[PDB]
Amino acid sequence: KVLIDRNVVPTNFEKWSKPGHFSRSLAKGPKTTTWIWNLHADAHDFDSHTNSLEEISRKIFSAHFGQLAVIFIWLSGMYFHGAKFSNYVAWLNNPINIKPSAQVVWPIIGQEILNADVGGGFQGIQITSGLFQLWRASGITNEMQLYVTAIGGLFMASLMLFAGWFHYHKAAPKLEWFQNVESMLNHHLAGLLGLGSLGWTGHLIHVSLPINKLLDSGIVPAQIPLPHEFILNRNLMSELYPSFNKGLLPFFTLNWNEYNDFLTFKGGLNPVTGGLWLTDIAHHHLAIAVIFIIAGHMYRTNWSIGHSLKEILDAHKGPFTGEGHRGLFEILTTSWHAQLAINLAMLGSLSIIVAHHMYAMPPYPYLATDYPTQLSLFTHHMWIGGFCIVGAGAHAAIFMVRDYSPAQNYNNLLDRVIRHRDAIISHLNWVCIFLGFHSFGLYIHNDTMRALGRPQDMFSDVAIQLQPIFAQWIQNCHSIAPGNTAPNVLATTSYVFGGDIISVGNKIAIMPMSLGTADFMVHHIHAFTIHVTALILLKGVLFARNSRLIPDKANLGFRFPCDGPGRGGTCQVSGWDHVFLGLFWMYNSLSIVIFHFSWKMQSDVWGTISSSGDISHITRGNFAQSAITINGWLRDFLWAQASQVIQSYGSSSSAYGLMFLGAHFVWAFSLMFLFSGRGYWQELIESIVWAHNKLKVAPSIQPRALSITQGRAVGVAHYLLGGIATTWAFFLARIIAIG
Amino acid sequence: HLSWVSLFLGFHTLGIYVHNDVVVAFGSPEKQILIEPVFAQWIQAASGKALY
Amino acid sequence: TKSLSVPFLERPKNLDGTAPGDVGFDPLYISDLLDIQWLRESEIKHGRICMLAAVGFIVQEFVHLPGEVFSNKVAIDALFQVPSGGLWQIFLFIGLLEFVMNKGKMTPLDMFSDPNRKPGDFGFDPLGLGKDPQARKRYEVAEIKNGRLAMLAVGGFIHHMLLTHQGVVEQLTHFRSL
Amino acid sequence: KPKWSKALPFMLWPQNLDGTMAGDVGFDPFGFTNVFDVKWMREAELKHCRIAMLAALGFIVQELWTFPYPYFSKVPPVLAHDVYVKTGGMSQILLFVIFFEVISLFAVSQMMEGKREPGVFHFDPLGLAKDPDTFRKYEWSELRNGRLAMIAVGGFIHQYWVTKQGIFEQLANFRPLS
Amino acid sequence: MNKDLLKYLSTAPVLGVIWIAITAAIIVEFNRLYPDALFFPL
Amino acid sequence: EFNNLIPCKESKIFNKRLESTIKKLENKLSKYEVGSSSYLAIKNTINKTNNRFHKYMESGVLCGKDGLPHLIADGRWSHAGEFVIPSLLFIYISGWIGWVGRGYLSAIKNTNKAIENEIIIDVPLALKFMSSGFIWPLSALREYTKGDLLMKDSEVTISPR
Numbered sequence A: 001k002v003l004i005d006r007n008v009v010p011t012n013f014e015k016w017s018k019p020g021h022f023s024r025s026l027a028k029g030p031k032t033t034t035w036i037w038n039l040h041a042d043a044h045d046f047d048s049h050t051n052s053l054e055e056i057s058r059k060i061f062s063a064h065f066g067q068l069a070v071i072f073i074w075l076s077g078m079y080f081h082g083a084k085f086s087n088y089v090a091w092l093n094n095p096i097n098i099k100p101s102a103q104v105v106w107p108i109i110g111q112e113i114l115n116a117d118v119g120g121g122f123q124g125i126q127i128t129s130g131l132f133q134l135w136r137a138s139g140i141t142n143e144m145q146l147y148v149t150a151i152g153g154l155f156m157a158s159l160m161l162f163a164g165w166f167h168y169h170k171a172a173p174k175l176e177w178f179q180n181v182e183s184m185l186n187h188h189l190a191g192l193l194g195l196g197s198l199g200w201t202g203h204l205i206h207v208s209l210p211i212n213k214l215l216d217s218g219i220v221p222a223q224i225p226l227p228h229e230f231i232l233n234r235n236l237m238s239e240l241y242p243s244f245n246k247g248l249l250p251f252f253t254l255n256w257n258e259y260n261d262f263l264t265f266k267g268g269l270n271p272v273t274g275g276l277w278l279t280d281i282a283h284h285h286l287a288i289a290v291i292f293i294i295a296g297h298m299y300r301t302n303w304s305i306g307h308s309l310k311e312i313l314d315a316h317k318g319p320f321t322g323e324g325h326r327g328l329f330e331i332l333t334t335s336w337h338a339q340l341a342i343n344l345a346m347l348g349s350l351s352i353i354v355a356h357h358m359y360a361m362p363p364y365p366y367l368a369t370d371y372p373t374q375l376s377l378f379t380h381h382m383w384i385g386g387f388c389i390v391g392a393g394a395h396a397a398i399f400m401v402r403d404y405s406p407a408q409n410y411n412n413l414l415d416r417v418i419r420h421r422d423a424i425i426s427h428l429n430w431v432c433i434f435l436g437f438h439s440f441g442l443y444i445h446n447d448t449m450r451a452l453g454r455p456q457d458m459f460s461d462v463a464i465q466l467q468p469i470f471a472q473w474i475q476n477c478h479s480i481a482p483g484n485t486a487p488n489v490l491a492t493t494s495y496v497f498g499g500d501i502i503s504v505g506n507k508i509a510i511m512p513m514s515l516g517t518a519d520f521m522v523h524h525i526h527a528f529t530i531h532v533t534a535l536i537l538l539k540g541v542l543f544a545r546n547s548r549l550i551p552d553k554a555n556l557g558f559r560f561p562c563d564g565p566g567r568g569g570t571c572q573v574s575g576w577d578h579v580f581l582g583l584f585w586m587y588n589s590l591s592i593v594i595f596h597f598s599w600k601m602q603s604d605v606w607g608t609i610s611s612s613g614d615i616s617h618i619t620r621g622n623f624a625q626s627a628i629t630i631n632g633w634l635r636d637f638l639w640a641q642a643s644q645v646i647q648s649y650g651s652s653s654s655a656y657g658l659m660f661l662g663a664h665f666v667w668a669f670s671l672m673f674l675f676s677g678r679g680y681w682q683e684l685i686e687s688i689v690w691a692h693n694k695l696k697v698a699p700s701i702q703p704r705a706l707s708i709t710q711g712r713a714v715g716v717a718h719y720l721l722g723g724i725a726t727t728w729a730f731f732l733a734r735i736i737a738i739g
Numbered sequence B: 001h002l003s004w005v006s007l008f009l010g011f012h013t014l015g016i017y018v019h020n021d022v023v024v025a026f027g028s029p030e031k032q033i034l035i036e037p038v039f040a041q042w043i044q045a046a047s048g049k050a051l052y
Numbered sequence C: 001t002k003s004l005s006v007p008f009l010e011r012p013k014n015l016d017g018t019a020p021g022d023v024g025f026d027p028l029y030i031s032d033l034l035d036i037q038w039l040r041e042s043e044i045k046h047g048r049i050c051m052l053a054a055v056g057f058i059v060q061e062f063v064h065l066p067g068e069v070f071s072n073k074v075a076i077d078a079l080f081q082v083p084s085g086g087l088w089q090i091f092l093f094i095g096l097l098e099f100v101m102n103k104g105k106m107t108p109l110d111m112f113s114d115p116n117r118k119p120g121d122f123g124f125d126p127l128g129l130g131k132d133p134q135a136r137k138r139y140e141v142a143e144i145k146n147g148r149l150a151m152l153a154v155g156g157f158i159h160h161m162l163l164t165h166q167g168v169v170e171q172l173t174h175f176r177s178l
Numbered sequence D: 001k002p003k004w005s006k007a008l009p010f011m012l013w014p015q016n017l018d019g020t021m022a023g024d025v026g027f028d029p030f031g032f033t034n035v036f037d038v039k040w041m042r043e044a045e046l047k048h049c050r051i052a053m054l055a056a057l058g059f060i061v062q063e064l065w066t067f068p069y070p071y072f073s074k075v076p077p078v079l080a081h082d083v084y085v086k087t088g089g090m091s092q093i094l095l096f097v098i099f100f101e102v103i104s105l106f107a108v109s110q111m112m113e114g115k116r117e118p119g120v121f122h123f124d125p126l127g128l129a130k131d132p133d134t135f136r137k138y139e140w141s142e143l144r145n146g147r148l149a150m151i152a153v154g155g156f157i158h159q160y161w162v163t164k165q166g167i168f169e170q171l172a173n174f175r176p177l178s
Numbered sequence E: 001m002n003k004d005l006l007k008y009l010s011t012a013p014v015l016g017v018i019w020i021a022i023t024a025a026i027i028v029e030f031n032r033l034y035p036d037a038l039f040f041p042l
Numbered sequence F: 001e002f003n004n005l006i007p008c009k010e011s012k013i014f015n016k017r018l019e020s021t022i023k024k025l026e027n028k029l030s031k032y033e034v035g036s037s038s039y040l041a042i043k044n045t046i047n048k049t050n051n052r053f054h055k056y057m058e059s060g061v062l063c064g065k066d067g068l069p070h071l072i073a074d075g076r077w078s079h080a081g082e083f084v085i086p087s088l089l090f091i092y093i094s095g096w097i098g099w100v101g102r103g104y105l106s107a108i109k110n111t112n113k114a115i116e117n118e119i120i121i122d123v124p125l126a127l128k129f130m131s132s133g134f135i136w137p138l139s140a141l142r143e144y145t146k147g148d149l150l151m152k153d154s155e156v157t158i159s160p161r
């Protein structure tokens, strides 16, 4: 049922000049600079503003439209820069020998040096977002199509902004509407995902397939018919894919094999572009569309048929788990934080899956041999995933403090987890120590043995071997699967598992990735860093409400600095403080993942092939022997590969040199916040305030040092920005020079 | 006053270094701010350094 | 409630129709941002300078002082030809005038501190032309209207000279289009 | 008000169209005035009306006559846009449109505060509607002519893009499509 | 102009950004028209 | 004195820097077609570079053995433009900002909106103060001698000692 209240909130600027109107605590106005920071920190903490779940839900729904508007403006900007300020068309004509660029700088204070020589007569910043490859796969062949997409984006942005306003101020849904989770799932599965995938199949078959087939055969872009020509003149299509002569009769009569020319199961890669076959991508999306449209008929809405989510959950209980999933349905229909926690965990995990899948099965034409794009996309999507996972921990902890009740959770799975939190955390503590010693300890062994002139005592491929035999065995299964356990597939899902060296131009797109001792060792580092990040976040959640040290922790809240210097000292016991610490470990963990990727690809995958067939890798296979000591990482990775960024001054890569130094600065500045405390700073401010009072220039809003918690927040935010931007600059300067 | 002198030195010393980095990075070392240490050179001359 | 000169806008609160030159013209409501007394003083002063400057531009095309330094019949070019030391003497003398005329009260905070101080009124009427109250009231409006006109004229004169590098009259006699 | 829309007998009269304004025959099927203020929409309607009417007449007169100088020189109206962007003539028109629109910013804000009626600038130099009844009559004509001109201009520009003929060139020949 | 809107335009961050942007523009425009002033020319 | 320095117009290293910079730009220029936007951009950089080097040559700024301008900041008037004149300009501007800001702060303290007017500026009041900054040196000097600049030590809070 549609349930709404009309004309709820007037539209005027009255409250815009009343900062902190939304909070009882903040509405009174500042006495102190602390108020200014609190205003920003509390702006989107909607459940701290009101107790009404209906009011909270309405703000959220409307804020979501706001986010979508922002995303459409950003998307529109990308298309517009493509149309107006790029070498897209030139690249379209000669994609092997032109670098993509869609940002051009104005000539002020000498910055026009940044307009690099990217080819096609063009000068601009070389982009690594993969937009050109995306647009090629979509069948876009001219700037007019980009312009029109940009305009459509501005229209969508305005429509989202209207809907946000409308659904808050004019027609706000009632709580009962939001709690229709069965209806929401049916629509998001069948409607959003199902019809989305079906719609995209439609584009693929009717636009992408023909245009890309003509491009790959070597037809000049300007000589290719416009998309609508393929729709109106079926003969144009049937020339390329003969099954179009038979029309839609095979579909309705279940003679689907007739369409096996444009719906394929090839595997491998297009040899011309080094990307997945678009006929496979078309079939993928059709299959996905069918499964999703069926999936979205599972739940009961307005008719007798379907499942109750509550009934499913309530049935799943066994002899080890008490009341089982009883009470979870109530949690997940009354707590936005509980929903956010799950959804961040999955969205983050998915981003990480996307990183891996896109490098190994490159879905776009000319992606694989655009090394800057491959490196950028993997790295970007790994970071987004990491941040989302830490967010899941934050919102799981906020739920435990604010939304958990004992009465709702009597002897269910949630209750039973917290009743053995000591067993969980103690074991995770142990597994982290075990992993730490038997992963990082092996590198230290190796450093020591090599320094002592005992290479024969090292863990290495040529001494004491640690072969990843299980991974090696899986690689073999995947390489022999085509025509066996996958009989109707022609080639491997990925050449990373084994098989041919695919090359485009004379650049290697993808080839088998051998796994040896160096690969075994770095995989156990990843296991280690992920387990520790989990430890910190899990501990935050399970001890959010109380511990042996602080029995009433929940009353202190989610975000508080400590409970004083007693009981030995209680700094950083809060759930928030576990997120703080978890961010550093996520940073540590993902830094090593992207370093592993960068080095392994350059050493063992990327490079040139001769006509004879002699592979020349970017770092010449040094990974196996260098990546088994810390000295090898310091010297052969950091020191060696930093040569590009560090020698960039006076060239078009000079921006990266500047960002590299700037990012080192922001990182170091973070340490001022992390290592100090506000007692020092508040005292310093007292002397400075004395000088202002003396000269009759002291503010009425009294200066305060940052709160204890804000000090920590500022510290970790500068640590991450500095740390991540350093690697960004390092990576881009390097890969743009050699790739 | 110690706070003032520290801020004064900090803002301007870091500032000049960053001016110099940006202008050298964009390929114009001739735009650098380069102050001769003439007071120290004068003290060297007072002890008999002829160079200056 | 409406402006007289812009009839679709509410009258600016500080324009009461009393001051000379007031037809309620302030569509950007500048008289709400800035002090009206200071604005009025500034308007008259800009006007008086531009009245002199307009006459200056013309007379300098024909009449000159002795010497090749005080030649040049284009006024904007004459600025860079004449002795720089002379321009400093004018500047510093204007500075002294500004200080004395305003009795050392030279900012919006203090210029109208005395209640008797009125915008533009320095008590300068040697010949006693404004002895008659009624005539003086007319002259107050004429001063402002002529000042306003001279401001726009001098704006022209300058931009015309930048475009042509000819005198005011030279351009009219030898009118060359764009 | 008449309950059922006059223009659409199968639809209710829009809730926020009260019947009193000129042009109102209950035509708002998409329900814009449910969410947006009618005063804002009418302000916009009349601005489009008045710009279009000037445009319609401009297209007509430009094809029948131009000013007798080579700077002008007959071209098709649609092409003239790019001609006079280059000369700077189009920037001149933009200069004074900006000026009037920045002023209008204050007019529109005061309208939304209820101090001004949509479309009113009190502009009637010749005094053609001193009587209320003639004014209301002319309100309807302004809307009707303005609404017509809005579409008409759409015709002119599109038909040119297709036919590559002027308004009167096309009426002289009138060749059908393929 | 609407008083509530004008009050919003008077808030510290809005005036902060506008004023810094104008100042920044002035410096940019000086350097665009008179570039490379290492010293006062005299 | 400054025997370790030389005028930049007499410097062979300074001239070689011009030559080498231009030579690089002309190589970059040869990659593009005459008349193209890229070509014109590089030409503008060449002109701007030439203008800069010639400006410094005609100025009488001294050059080191590196062939780069070195500035003298000891007070001698033959190098006034290198530091003293910029310094006076900075002090005049910075003193203005400080003085008008101090004036605004004091004005709002004499109201009921002492705190509100810090986060929501009274813009008319602010512009009045900002407009009055041009004689801040004299204002500040008179305020000092009047005894209105400073509070007494006994009227400002201090901690225990």
Ligand code: CLA
Residues within 6 Å of the ligand: A009, A010, A011, A012, A013, A015, A016, A017, A021, A022, A058, A059, A060, A062, A063, A065, A066, A070, A161, A162, A163, A164, A165, A168, A169
């Ligand atoms: C168009 C005019 C308009 C007006 C006059 C109002 C007026 C109001 N809104 Mg509404 N609203 C609107 C449009 C409007 N809204 C739109 C388009 C949406 C969809 C997002 C909403 C959704 C909405 C919600 C969910 C809520 C309101 C609320 C309110 C009230 C308080 C607003 C306030 O004080 O914050 C002023 C805040 C701003 C000016 C900042 C907004 C920032 C925008 C959204 C994003 C900026 C882009 C990006 C982040 C910039 C980054 C820069 C970069 C450097 C990082 C006020 C009555 C609140 C209320 O309490 O009512 C009872 C409330 O909870 N509105």
Ligand code: CLA
Residues within 6 Å of the ligand: A665, A668, A669, A670, A671, A672, A673, A675, A676, A680, A684, B003, B004, B006, B007, B008, B009, B010, B011, B014
């Ligand atoms: C690179 C690392 C770093 C930097 C830059 C600073 C900087 C500073 N420290 Mg800190 N400190 C550090 C590490 C650092 N510290 C560490 C590791 C510790 C151990 C915990 C401390 C402990 C410490 C103590 C105990 C004290 C200081 C003090 C200071 C100030 C000294 C005076 C000065 O230089 O003013 C000049 C200011 C700077 C150099 C700061 C940066 C200015 C930036 C670059 C301006 C950028 C503006 C620009 C428009 C960009 C805006 C960004 C945008 C997002 C808005 C200065 C703010 C002292 C102080 O406060 O004296 C008054 C003081 O007592 N520090």
Ligand code: CLA
Residues within 6 Å of the ligand: C177, C178, D084, D087, D088, D089, D090, D092, D093, D096, D097
């Ligand atoms: C209010 C002052 C004003 C001024 C000084 C200008 C000045 C100009 N206009 Mg602009 N213009 C204005 C208002 C103004 N315009 C207005 C209100 C509009 C309506 C939007 C326009 C629309 C417009 C267009 C479409 C074009 C211009 C062009 C020009 C330029 C023509 C150059 C030329 O060769 O002149 C030659 C002049 C003559 C042969 C003498 C003509 C004499 C007339 C009467 C003008 C004198 C008017 C005077 C300033 C005030 C009253 C005089 C008095 C006798 C009553 C010139 C820079 C043109 C351009 O850009 O050229 C490149 C152009 O195409 N203007």
Ligand code: CLA
Residues within 6 Å of the ligand: A687, A688, A689, A691, A692, A695, A697, B001, B003, B004, B007, F097, F098, F099, F100, F101, F102, F104, F121, F126, F127, F129, F130
């Ligand atoms: C009108 C504002 C004003 C004035 C006159 C002063 C004056 C002073 N400050 Mg203070 N200060 C200010 C604002 C101001 N400050 C603000 C906003 C901050 C927070 C960043 C500080 C933080 C600060 C520190 C940490 C220290 C001083 C110190 C000093 C003294 C030495 C000079 C200095 O080091 O400045 C340095 C100050 C800065 C670099 C901060 C930036 C100043 C901003 C740009 C001014 C803001 C202007 C304001 C927004 C204008 C609005 C006016 C308008 C509404 C009319 C001097 C008494 C020092 C001292 O005690 O020496 C004895 C000292 O150590 N100030």
Ligand SMILES: CC1=C(/C=C/C(C)=C/C=C/C(C)=C/C=C/C=C(C)/C=C/C=C(C)/C=C/C2=C(C)C[C@@H](O)CC2(C)C)C(C)(C)C[C@H](O)C1
Residues within 6 Å of the ligand: C045, C048, C049, C052, C065, C066, C067, C068, C069, C083, C086, C090, C094, C097, C098, C101
């Ligand atoms: C070099 C030398 C020569 C000597 C040069 C010598 C004798 C000539 C000196 C000329 C002087 C006396 C002219 C005086 C210049 C008068 C000025 C231009 C007045 C400024 C008025 C302002 C603009 C008032 C504005 C304002 C008013 C309107 C209103 C107030 O409220 C505000 C202020 C802002 C004050 C020669 C001739 C021998 C030739 C030889 O070959 C070389």
Ligand SMILES: CC1=C(/C=C/C(C)=C/C=C/C(C)=C/C=C/C=C(C)/C=C/C=C(C)/C=C/C2=C(C)C[C@@H](O)CC2(C)C)C(C)(C)C[C@H](O)C1
Residues within 6 Å of the ligand: D078, D081, D082, D150, D151, D153, D154, D155, D157
């Ligand atoms: C209601 C009504 C019905 C009418 C309904 C019907 C569908 C109405 C739809 C009319 C629309 C489509 C008009 C569209 C108007 C199009 C606009 C006006 C185009 C602007 C072009 C610009 C202005 C060019 C700029 C140019 C470009 C882009 C680029 C530059 O280089 C050159 C210039 C030159 C500047 C009926 C029929 C049933 C009858 C009944 O009685 C009631």
Ligand SMILES: COC1=C(OC)C(=O)C(C/C=C(\C)CC/C=C(\C)CC/C=C(\C)CCC=C(C)C)=C(C)C1=O
Residues within 6 Å of the ligand: A672, A673, A674, A676, A677, A678, A681, A704, A705, A706, A707, A708, A710, A711, A712, E016
């Ligand atoms: C334990 O860690 C720390 C603290 O406590 C937890 C601190 O407190 C501080 C000190 C830092 C403070 C007080 C924040 C600095 C904030 C700024 C720069 C002031 C903001 C001022 C304005 C917006 C006005 C300026 C106006 C314009 C430029 C327009 C530091 C360094 C710290 O390590």
Ligand code: SF4
Residues within 6 Å of the ligand: A561, A562, A563, A564, A565, A569, A570, A571, A572, A677, A708
């Ligand atoms: S040191 Fe800080 S965080 Fe730790 S107990 Fe004391 S006040 Fe709390």
